[PDB]
């Protein structure tokens, strides 16, 4: 399958874990993968990670040739800055059909912990095999997007304060959301039956 990739930076706190559960390794059935994200943890609250994501590398160290326990030792001994290179299954492209119509709605949200409480996946890419609309794949319960109640997994992010996301990469779309201010109006596209 064609994969999307993304870089996630997590700041580790002196007396705590990341709330990130990792499965896999050369001695295991699967490759290194996010298998759980602890509720309210650093990893969950980043809004950049999802269960099922593959971890290709931590701090520029490729994980694939490590045994499971070696990957864990690596993660437990990282300093405050953890840099995960992540690969993920691309979001399916929703297409307008006879029974599916697209509509839009403006959603205003305020930040909390510098995030809007949703994960985006996809984005423009030179390799058209990897190129996708920017899809909101997860909405963290209790977070801003969840509280406001409009945005749903599968919805597309079209613009952020009138800045349109067409042609923008995943990294670019993330920066637009980061360099956003504490409030933002987002344009959301979604599926309607018939």
């Amino acid at each position: 399958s064609f994969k999307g990739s993304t870089v996630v930076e997590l700041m580790k706190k002196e007396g705590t874990t990341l709330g990130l559960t990792v499965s896999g390794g050369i001695d295991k059935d699967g490759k290194p993968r996010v298998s759980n994200l602890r509720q309210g943890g650093i990893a969950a609250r980043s809004d950049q990670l999802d269960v099922g994501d593959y971890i290709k590398a931590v701090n520029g160290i490729n994980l694939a040739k490590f045994r499971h326990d070696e990957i864990i030792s690596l993660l437990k001994n990282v300093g405050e800055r953890v840099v995960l290179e992540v690969e993920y299954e691309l979001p399916p492209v929703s297409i307008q059909g006879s029974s599916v119509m697209f509509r839009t709605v403006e959603v205003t949200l305020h930040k909390e912990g510098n995030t809007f409480g949703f994960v985006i996946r996809g984005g423009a890419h030179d390799d058209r095999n990897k190129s996708r609309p920017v899809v909101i794949t997860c909405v963290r319960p209790g977070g801003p997007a969840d509280r406001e109640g409009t945005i749903k997994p599968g919805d597309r992010l079209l613009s952020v304060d009138g800045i349109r996301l067409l042609g923008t990469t995943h990294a670019e779309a993330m920066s637009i959301l980061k360099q956003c201010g504490q409030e933002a109006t987002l344009l959301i596209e979604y599926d309607v039956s018939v």
């Binding site: 874990t17 559960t21 990792v22 499965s23 896999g24 499971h68 437990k76």
Partner: peptide
């Protein structure tokens, strides 16, 4: 898997 193992939690970190």
């Amino acid at each position: 898997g193992t939690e970190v």
